Amino acid sequence: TINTTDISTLNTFIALNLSFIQNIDFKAIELYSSAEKRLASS
């Protein structure tokens, strides 16, 4: 009499190794600095 854990167990899983979607934070950007905007007031 022995434990069932000692007996090797085989498994048949075709591993559906997925890959989820990471989350990015969209940094707000701009082209022309406010200093240049003032310099363009002329």
Binding site: Y32, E36, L39, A40, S42
Partner: protein, 51 residues
């Protein structure tokens, strides 16, 4: 595309002529100021003046 306006320096010359006419009655002050006409400079003498 750059938007900084082009900058540089400049030198300007002017000639101003004005008159004061204040003696109204016996003697007055600031009775009438002249036209105060501003005029350009004669270049050649001005260049000598500039020189």
């Amino acid at each position: 595309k750059n938007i900084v306006p082009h900058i540089f320096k400049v030198r300007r010359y002017r000639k101003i002529a004005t008159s004061v006419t204040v003696y109204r009655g016996h003697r007055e002050s600031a009775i009438t100021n002249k036209y105060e006409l501003p005029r350009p400079v004669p270049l050649y003498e001005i260049s000598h003046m500039d020189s």
